[PDB]
Amino acid sequence: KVEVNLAAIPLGKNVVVKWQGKPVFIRHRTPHEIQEANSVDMSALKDPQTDADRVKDPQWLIMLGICTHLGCVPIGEAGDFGGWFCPCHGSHYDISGRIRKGPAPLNLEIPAYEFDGDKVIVG
Amino acid sequence: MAFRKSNVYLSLVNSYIIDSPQPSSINYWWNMGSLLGLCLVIQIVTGIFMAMHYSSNIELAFSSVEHIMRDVHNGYILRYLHANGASFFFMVMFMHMAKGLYYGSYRSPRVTLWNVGVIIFILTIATAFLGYCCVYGQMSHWGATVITNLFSAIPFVGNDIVSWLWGGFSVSNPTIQRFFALHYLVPFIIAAMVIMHLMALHIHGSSNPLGITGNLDRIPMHSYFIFKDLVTVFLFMLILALFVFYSPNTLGHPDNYIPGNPLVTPASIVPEWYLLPFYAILRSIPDKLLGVITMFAAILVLLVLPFTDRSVVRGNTFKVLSKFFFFIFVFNFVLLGQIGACHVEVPYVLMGQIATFIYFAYFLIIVPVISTIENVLFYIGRVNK
Amino acid sequence: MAFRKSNVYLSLVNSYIIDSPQPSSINYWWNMGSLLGLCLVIQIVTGIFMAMHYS
Amino acid sequence: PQSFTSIARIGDYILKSPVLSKLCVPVANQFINLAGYKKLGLKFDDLIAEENPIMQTALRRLPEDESYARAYRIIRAHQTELTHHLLPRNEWIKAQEDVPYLLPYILEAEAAAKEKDELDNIEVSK
Amino acid sequence: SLYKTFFKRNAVFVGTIFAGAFVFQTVFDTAITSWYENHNKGKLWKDVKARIAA
Amino acid sequence: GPPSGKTYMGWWGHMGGPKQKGITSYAVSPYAQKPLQGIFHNAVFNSFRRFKSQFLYVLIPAGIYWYWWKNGNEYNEFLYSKAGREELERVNV
Amino acid sequence: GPPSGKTYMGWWGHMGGPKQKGITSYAVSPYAQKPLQGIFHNAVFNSFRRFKSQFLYVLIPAGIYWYWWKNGNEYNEFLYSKAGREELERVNV
Amino acid sequence: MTAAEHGLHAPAYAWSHNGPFETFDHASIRRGYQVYREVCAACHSLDRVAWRTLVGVSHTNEEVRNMAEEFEYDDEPDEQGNPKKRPGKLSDYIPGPYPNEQAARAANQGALPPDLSLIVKARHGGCDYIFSLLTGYPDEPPAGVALPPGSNYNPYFPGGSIAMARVLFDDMVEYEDGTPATTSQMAKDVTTFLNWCAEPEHDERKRLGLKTVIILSSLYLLSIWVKKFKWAGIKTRKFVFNPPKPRK
Amino acid sequence: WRTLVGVSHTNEEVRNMAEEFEYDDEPDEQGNPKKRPGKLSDYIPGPYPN
């Protein structure tokens, strides 16, 4: 359970740290996130989920890359919305990180990272 | 008496490979079991000599196998004879098992010999899997990832046995160091199951292609079947040498010459060619728990065969219908291995669901039904009431 | 006959550790050979569990 | 391991039926000629497996004139297959000779073993 | 005759087999290396090293 | 040790078959026979008889399974072409 | 298999000793006997008899080899002292 | 999948080391190292090849020593503990251009160039794929495909969009022996040099394979003769039956 | 550092002792070297480099 820092990853970046042995998707934030993460009706989907169920420490985001095909890896820094791109079969995880289309049945896991102040423990 | 009969240690050799009574009519299909004993000696010897130069740490493993192939004197001969030797070991075993399935060698009084054989087959699949991971190529990391994650579907004990296999939270350095140490051991457990296997053959002896008693015409082993076994030994070495010296990378995958990368996934992750029929059976069931049960059930379904054969005749020599359906099962096993090397696409999903039903239906439906029909067909053809 | 005398594998166990005839007067110096069989089992087991962590 | 009592139970229902015995008997005659045991010099009752007590009992009770002739047919057959040949066409078994010489000894060994089991695990009328 | 000395004993013949195998390896190797290098002459290093000696 | 359970096979002198009476056997030494006169008139005339007896039980199953494999390929070839894009969209979902 | 060479031991029923005639044996059950009345009057009175019979064959050799070890030590102690420097110089060369 | 996602099938050219009795052409290996040093080595490493393995294969010993001496390696620290550098020697390994993977991607717009010591064995196609990749860039992509910024079209690459650009043009090197250095010629040499980097045992492996196959093929034919001789008594054995008289 | 917790010092004490040293981090986005403070998984450093 690692803690790099909190003012070490600037805004428009991300680092796939080898945290605990995984391609996990760090993402530093701005209120420039609840802008546009749920501007889409949920029921146009495999079977949905809401921001408040997603993560309620909402200005530092982390998500796994252990994909439910056989372990595929998405993008860094491209797309139409600005999401994460599966070349394996086909998918683009939007800014909130969800289906637009594809045979991917579900979104994975936001690692159970808890806040207490001065360091956020991932895991 | 002769000294080879009175000495405690030579008496065993005499009783097994010199004076053992054999049926005179056995053919060259009875020579595959001696080859499997040579395969095990090849695989064990070549492995000791490579293990002197190997390093099992995850940052040193891949480059240690290249050190064997570049710097060790006659090191490329040791490895290729090892990698192609295992593919030859599995091909002779599929022929050995299909023989006993044709001539009825599983029936009474040889049920115990057939059950110890099914245990050898399980331990040999395990051995070959563990050693393919000691290379730590790209197929070697991602093959261990998807197989060890199948035990996560066992209820209430799944996530604990996976973290205990891995030694951590992923396929990592503890995983590769323990797979190498398991891999050296299990070949010596196989050698003890082979001794138990031969002991169960000695009390009743071998069968014959006619399926009747052999106690009326017996010849000894020495200089009839010692020199008939020598014919197939030199053909085995000749065909193996052709692959080791002129085509040594045609039965493997190219992506295993890339070092293992947990962050980059390959476009197609497949096992070696001899685990592909069982990989397509797992891929046929759209549920994690039931696919794992069905994959293992495909190996243990061989054990119900002594009970579902309802015939009074041993073997398929004089059987018309049971001979046609023996070869449907053979070519269904080749299509399963071939489906398992394809993509998950239409129509390769339905083709693998029908062909995995024909695998389980042969043992449980087809054999007992046509064997009953053939009994009654022999009766009414002679008895005229 | 009993199953331990008719089965191919249990017959060896019966002939060696159950029904084997022994002299009645042997003393405790005849017990060292069974200990040496336990020593070999201890070493092979402990060494295999360490070899998973060795370099 | 289907019993011979059961095989004859089914077979005698087919043979004594007019409509059934004309579709399955021609089929069964081609099944025996394609099998090819008569070309090795064998009768069908030689092919039956004999590693069980009901067949060891029937062979002890077989007369010795018929027992000596059975052992010669089995030795001649192992030698014909060893050479990868067939016998001459005038030494083949004919259909008249392909008789069930061992069936009657089998059926009486089976009826006695069943009678014993029914008595060893009977419950009393009282 | 021939058989009473060629192979009558097998101390005649396991020593002749072993002594004759030692001579076989040397004569066999020199014949294969000469055919292999002549079948691929012009491509070897010793031929390239003899064309750049200016 | 003691004797174990009895079997369906013995040893030289007592093999457990039926008693033999009236069978006579003859043989000749190998040294007195001409070298290997059994390879030819056996690789053409006999090998063809053995082939013709049994080839039908192998090649009718092989023809069924190979025809099924080619029709599966050619259909998969077609779905991922430009002409087979509309049929691919239906049979997926 | 066949029989092997004969030995000097058999099995229950045929052990290979001489024939017995005129020997009778008696015994009593363990359940009918009092618990372990054989530890005391055996750890003092009998154990002393066993010690006195055999202790002389061990302790005379042990006394010889231990006396030889101490005289070797004490002499080596002395050679590497200040008083034993002149004798060390001779017995070396 | 679609044919564009699998890539185009590399054809079959007639390499002079194909065949069971053929060796490498060693004048193309020497010629091929010159194309590596002057074109490829700016952006590709060869970390598994040592200087000493080139002696007696492509260069003389005196030539190879002068090639290694033009680089700097890390020596062991002096008497106070400060670091030292030294020139190269024969036991050293051929050095690469970049110090770490972070710097390699920074100079190639995010893409990482792989090590080439095993690229012939780690790709389906072998020498036929490496050659066709380099001579397979068209001068304008086909109508319809929209390339991302910073990628080039090559139909032999799976997907049709590769981060490498064309690097072979006519007469960019001048060969010592005087061979015309066209595009197809330079490609044939690097692919021959790089196969030697993957398979240094190729020449003497196929020499020990000729001996093994000739010896074992003779033992296999002698085994058949011996077996038939020793089995001749059983095959010609005869049997006859005379029914005993019924009195026993 | 982590082996001292629960033996001689509290967890908060040990973190402040490790933070007074510099260790080698993994390089930046261009490939240049980085340093960082210490953490509990680190090993106690020595005075001399070689």
Ligand SMILES: CCCCCCCCCCC(=O)OC[C@H](COP(=O)(O)OC[C@H](O)COP(=O)(O)OC[C@@H](COC(=O)CC)OC(=O)CCC)OC(=O)CCCCCCCC
């Ligand atoms: C890598 C290891 C290599 C060895 C593995 C294969 C060896 C076992 C295969 C069994 C076999 O021998 O094939 C025969 C099979 C069924 O036929 P069968 O059992 O009734 O007759 C046997 C009779 O004793 C022959 O032997 P035969 O008595 O006729 O004469 C001796 C023969 C020696 O040949 C051999 O060495 C055979 C290994 O003489 C010569 O050939 C001289 C050379 C001119 O009919 C066939 O021909 C099918 C071929 C096999 C196809 C299945 C395997 C493909 C994957």
Ligand SMILES: CCCCCCCCCCC(=O)OC[C@H](COP(=O)(O)OC[C@H](O)COP(=O)(O)OC[C@@H](COC(=O)CC)OC(=O)CCC)OC(=O)CCCCCCCC
């Ligand atoms: C370092 C690794 C070692 C670990 C293994 C330890 C085992 C070492 C055993 C060595 C040995 O075999 O010496 C045997 C010898 C006894 O010979 P014996 O059969 O005539 O005595 C039967 C007894 O009277 C009945 O004794 P009982 O059968 O009634 O109970 C046995 C019990 C002791 O019971 C008592 O409370 C005192 C009587 O437990 C044992 O005695 C355990 C066995 C030591 O022992 C003796 O008492 C005398 C010989 C002394 C040996 C010393 C030299 C060895 C270095």
Ligand SMILES: CCCCCCCCCCCCCCCCCC(=O)OC[C@H](COP(=O)(O)OCCN)OC(=O)CCCCCCCCCCCCC
């Ligand atoms: C879980 C494990 C499952 C294991 C299944 C593995 C399947 C692959 C195994 C491949 C070997 C299978 C060959 C069959 C061997 C069984 C014994 C046998 O078939 O031989 C008897 C058969 C009959 O012909 P005979 O003239 O020799 O008469 C003697 C008795 N009637 O003589 C013959 O051999 C028939 C002629 C040869 C047929 C060759 C056809 C191809 C066989 C498949 C090979 C692999 C795919 C090409």
Ligand code: HEM
């Ligand atoms: C039944 C016996 C054996 C089987 C079936 C077997 C199978 C295999 C296989 C399939 C591989 C991977 C081959 C490759 O693609 O490179 C392998 C690798 C390896 N095995 Fe074996 N093996 C056996 C016995 C042994 C033994 C007894 C040892 C050690 C004494 C051993 C040591 C190794 C080593 C060091 C490697 C890695 C080097 C390499 O890749 O060749 N093997 N084994």
Ligand code: HEM
């Ligand atoms: C290392 C693996 C094995 C070895 C060394 C081995 C060895 C042997 C040998 C020497 C024989 C006697 C000769 C022969 O029948 O060819 C034999 C027979 C037999 N084996 Fe195996 N075997 C192995 C694996 C297996 C397997 C995997 C099975 C079945 C699942 C099996 C089942 C049998 C049977 C049923 C027989 C008796 C056949 C008959 O007498 O007709 N064995 N084995």
Ligand code: HEM
């Ligand atoms: C008869 C059986 C064995 C004997 C007598 C034996 C003896 C020894 C001895 C004396 C040591 C050095 C102990 C020390 O001072 O540290 C040692 C070390 C070692 N042995 Fe064994 N050994 C046996 C079996 C095995 C086996 C089967 C393995 C399997 C891998 C093994 C693995 C090791 C390892 C990994 C070490 C180094 C770790 C250590 O020092 O404890 N041993 N062995």
Ligand code: HEM
């Ligand atoms: C300075 C010149 C070169 C530069 C800047 C360069 C750059 C690159 C880059 C960025 C890639 C990654 C491709 C991707 O990920 O899409 C690559 C791959 C590759 N390069 Fe180069 N390269 C150069 C010269 C060469 C030459 C001359 C060869 C052939 C001898 C070569 C052989 C390869 C191969 C085989 C690949 C992998 C292709 C594959 O995986 O299918 N490179 N190169």
Ligand SMILES: COc1c(O)c(C)c(C/C=C(/C)CC/C=C(\C)CC/C=C(\C)CC/C=C(\C)CC/C=C(\C)CCC=C(C)C)c(O)c1OC
């Ligand atoms: C049906 O008739 C038969 C029959 O035909 C046959 C062939 C057999 C025999 C069949 C077999 C398959 C034989 C069994 C063979 C094994 C069980 C193999 C087990 C043994 C090994 C694999 C050997 C292990 C090797 C070593 C321990 C040493 C290797 C390492 C070395 C030499 C390195 C040494 C170090 C240095 C520094 C030189 C029968 O039993 C039989 O029944 C009557």
Ligand SMILES: COc1c(O)c(C)c(C/C=C(/C)CC/C=C(\C)CC/C=C(\C)CC/C=C(\C)CC/C=C(\C)CCC=C(C)C)c(O)c1OC
């Ligand atoms: C005189 O009367 C006697 C008598 O008193 C006795 C005791 C015996 C029996 C005596 C013995 C000494 C028994 C023999 C003991 C052996 C031969 C020891 C053999 C030990 C092994 C083969 C070791 C087996 C160990 C393993 C397989 C380890 C398992 C490890 C696992 C599962 C770890 C998994 C992880 C990895 C990395 C492999 C007699 O035979 C006898 O004669 C009649």
Ligand SMILES: CCCCCCCCCCCCCCC(=O)OCCCOP(=O)(O)OC[C@@H](O)COP(=O)(O)OCCCOC(C)=O
């Ligand atoms: C606690 C219970 C057991 C204690 C001691 C048991 C001793 C085991 C055998 C003693 C009894 C022998 C007398 C005959 C008998 O009834 O037993 C059969 C013995 C076993 O036969 P086998 O070795 O399988 O032969 C099988 C034959 O092939 C001859 O064998 P081979 O292939 O030469 O084996 C060597 C290969 C590897 O062996 C190793 C390394 O262990």
Ligand SMILES: CCCCCCCCCCCCCCCCCC(=O)O[C@H](COC(=O)CCCCCC)COP(=O)(O)OCCN
């Ligand atoms: C030198 C190597 C060691 C050689 C072996 C000696 C040591 C003995 C091994 C340990 C003994 C345990 C044996 C189990 C006893 C029961 C066997 C049995 O029931 O025989 C069989 C069934 O066994 C099996 O299914 C396979 C045995 C798996 C072996 C496990 C490793 C029953 O057969 P049965 O004798 O009753 O007659 C046929 C009736 N259908």
Ligand code: FES
């Ligand atoms: S990998 Fe996520 S959709 Fe294909």
